Design a protein around this ligand. Structure first.
Ligand code: FES
Ligand code: FES
Ligand code: FES
Ligand code: FES
Ligand code: FES
Ligand code: FES
Ligand code: FES
Ligand code: FES
Ligand code: FES
Ligand code: FES
Ligand code: FES
Ligand code: FES
Lengths: 110, 110, 110, 110, 110, 110, 110, 110, 110, 110, 110, 110
């Protein structure tokens, strides 16, 4: 299913990028702002990996690189990573919908 | 309460702008894309009104005017109209969160 | 410190909004009622500025707008500005404690 | 004629002072309370202007100053500005009778 | 009541400035000439205070300053302090009418 | 003895100059502003006379002429005519004190 | 040059206000008392003209008005007209220093 | 109709922009240089307004902005504001002709 | 001058924002969609700069900030950046007309 | 070819709607603003015809009706008529590209 | 140090007066011309402030007023504000030397 | 005899009160402002003496005490010390005229 819960905002450290391999998403929290970024490389579909030390997203298939917000700056990647719809449910749980693409600037503050 | 249901997607005609006075929002449907736009003028807070013939939003207070997308072009309004988070709930009804403002180009496909 | 003096009531004009940039608060006097409003924008935390010309609060970071009482009406601000505890000390000076938030329409009559 | 319409409440911003120079009155809206104040200075009869920046009324003829409520505090003005009868008509229009002067604290809630 | 008695000429020392806080006036005696000066700052209405050593009036709100005669020289004050009507009554007591403002150069000899 | 009552403001037409020969004063009413002007010519002391047509004061002794405000403009008159203290007593009657000279711009509003 | 002669005391009539457009000052003689007053309006600097009939100074730009002593009472002028240093030279001619401003009550008797 | 008087050079402050709404022109004075600028926006013909605070011209219809000299820099305005001919009549009156458009660099020195 | 070529579509990388300082415009390519955006800040006219990492336009003068599409969100900028008419000429190279502003959502696909 | 010329701007009277059957477009002139609107009904593709008497576009197939700007308001038409790219070439004739759709608010000023 | 950097010419709007409060200077840019004006009032040394609304410099200590070019016209200020040395460094940075005063007519064009 | 010179501004240190008993005046220098104050006690005419320690003027005859500006505060002295006319002659020497008394707030800045 594209729609699913990810956890309460407390399960995510401030300034952390959490990788959900099965869900095909990153959960990026900056201060109190939350973002959901897809792991799918925009080149041919490989799974991008985040490096904490380099603070970038890197594709091991053809060397595409993305900044923390997902914008492509190196490699054959032609466009930024897809940002996904993320809401806080009525019971304090974060919900992500991979079927709903959102503009890159979208953020969820808690 | 800023969180509330708005109706099923089919209660909104294709290519129509629906004014929900009580909820102080607009529900704009273009083809199958839905947007939620606040009625509050970004100047001093008056409730703007949509003109179907002129295809623009007009404020009754000092004459600020916005395009269909919410971009301000006339009057002292310094910002575009606020776009609001709108989700499709599993019970088939559209829900709007007034407290969550979203980027201008956000859309929900059905 | 969260606790500090802001001056005597006679130092504040009737119908005035006084910005204490160091203390990061506003002192609002309407007739004989005094209010303490925090400058911290409820969006991402920037310091809002009061527009004497437009009688509203403006945040320069993302364009949030608040009414004189602190209630937001435009921009990404989700909730009204924080009102702070304000007491009249024995020595005739007004004392504000930013650590104690008070309801929106709280007021100190003198 | 001493009776005229001034518009619907939705045409007046919250916390605004509107000058109707032809009608020679002010329309003051605080929250949902409406007040009608005459522009005639109580000194020698000149037309008083409202200063949005200073939140006061000032007469250009001899320098009288009035608080936002119309009470004089500086200049040769002897008594506060006249407040006028303001009614909400059944057709949603605000009606003012400038020949009927009302007490200072009179207000119309909507 | 704006009309009130203030006292006989002998209760005010020669070359003294007497502050009537409750009456919101100054009684200035130079030799045998008496003057009644209002305490209200012509900027936004705060109560100014007289400094005998500096021989000037100072407003505690925004730093407007007035000379002994009431002429403003510092701060945003756009007008001199209001001079008030003062008479010597039948019973030898001075009466002040704050509702009657008099030109700056007015004086009462005894 | 030099203090005396002159009558109620109703006994003086608007825009009229009334000569009180036994009181050696004028009572000038413009709209609702009253002035008390001495009839003593500032040249050698003759009694000046007002012309309702020419709207000026004329001295028949040596041809000195004064404006309605008392300003000398013709003849050997060195000064303007003296303005005198005039108050509205508690019993609604106008009182003039010829022993108390006031600045030329003094006026009494009723 | 700021310093210059304006003539001998007897070249100025008693009770006269003489305008010296060449030097942009007024020479006011009341009996034997002389004053030097600048023509520059304290608002935005226009040349003020004296009306002998009204006995006031008037600015042609935005309607500021001053009394004979220079005190502002009408218009946006926030300060009285500047009074200038004036001495009686040994050779019997009056000298004015425009660069040296003096208190408003200053007078030079000859 | 296209030729009319606007007043004498003494009626315009140094470094001022004067708006003549009834005549649809601006009078700009820098030092002793006078310029006439048309208020007609070069976009679709609305009347532009001068912002004293921002030292720019603003059109309220579609948000075009012009510098003080009339050159457009923002908005759909394609060309700078029209400069109009201004002559100094030999009787001391300034005359403008809105029908005669002149280069932006032309000026009338007095 | 307002009309000029900018080059062929192949000379602009996919997902790139190229700044043409000489012509004071941006050429934005998203996939095969092209856009011409002016560099002039809609506040006071300074040249904004694009941050590839932050994916925003920033004004160096007073801190106005714009999204990739030109929508203003920070600073005193009251309107979005101007979008410009851009054509693909017959000889295969793109042409821009600075004099012709087009709606914000305009795009040229190749 | 979808890129064709239409004539000079003066070939179209002010306030006219010109239907070009062979080119499948409308040319709309309001004052000096030009628009190119496609005749294709957005329902099933019939050629829409304009009515001058009632200032609307009408599809003869199933009764779809559009406002003068192309906005659909009657019939099964789900979206407004397509607006087309229209530029003024160097040779003084307008060029239309039916293959380049533009936003509804696009206009060409001459 | 009296000599310090101010920034790049791109950081200053056209036709602007920029206040560097900590450095006690103004930076005035007209077109491509730059000038530096000291904030020290020539009266007694207080820091003057620029009024964007009135396009003048104001000193709060004794009410001195200066034109935009810095010359005094009202108040006890005896001489115009000081202009300061301003040089363009070969690394593209503007530098001001507080200790080196230059004539008002000196300008730095870029 | 009463019109005598005192010396160049060099010979008076900053913040000093120099007693000239043969000329019977004080010379007070605050920063660059000079004042000439008579030594004659307002009580009966004894020569008061300045105490650099207590920063006051004291009369040895009956205990009258003045503030540094000449304002009387102790003893039977009824009015402040006389301030005398002081001018800077073109040869760099200050000239004092004991026959010309000036307001207390008079100052001479060099
Ligand atoms: S699939 Fe990711 S870089 Fe190619
Ligand atoms: S509140 Fe909408 S234009 Fe002012
Ligand atoms: S921090 Fe205030 S609007 Fe974003
Ligand atoms: S008429 Fe208003 S102050 Fe005189
Ligand atoms: S109220 Fe007195 S200076 Fe502001
Ligand atoms: S006494 Fe009046 S003119 Fe001589
Ligand atoms: S310059 Fe004198 S009132 Fe404006
Ligand atoms: S008419 Fe001025 S911008 Fe449209
Ligand atoms: S000019 Fe761009 S923010 Fe001021
Ligand atoms: S095709 Fe036009 S109404 Fe069906
Ligand atoms: S220091 Fe500026 S006027 Fe006195
Ligand atoms: S003379 Fe000085 S106290 Fe008497």
């Amino acid at each position: 299913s594209p729609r699913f819960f990810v956890g309460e905002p407390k399960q995510f450290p401030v300034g952390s990028v959490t990788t959900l391999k099965s869900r095909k998403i990153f959960v990026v929290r900056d201060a109190d702002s939350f973002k959901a970024i897809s792991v799918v490389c925009t080149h041919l579909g490989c799974a991008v990996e985040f490096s904490k030390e380099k603070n970038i997203f890197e594709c091991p298939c053809h060397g595409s690189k993305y900044y923390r917000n997902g914008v492509n700056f190196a490699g054959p990647a032609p466009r930024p990573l897809d940002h996904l719809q993320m809401i806080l449910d009525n019971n304090g749980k974060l919900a992500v919908d991979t079927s709903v693409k959102v503009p890159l600037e979208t953020e969820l503050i808690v």
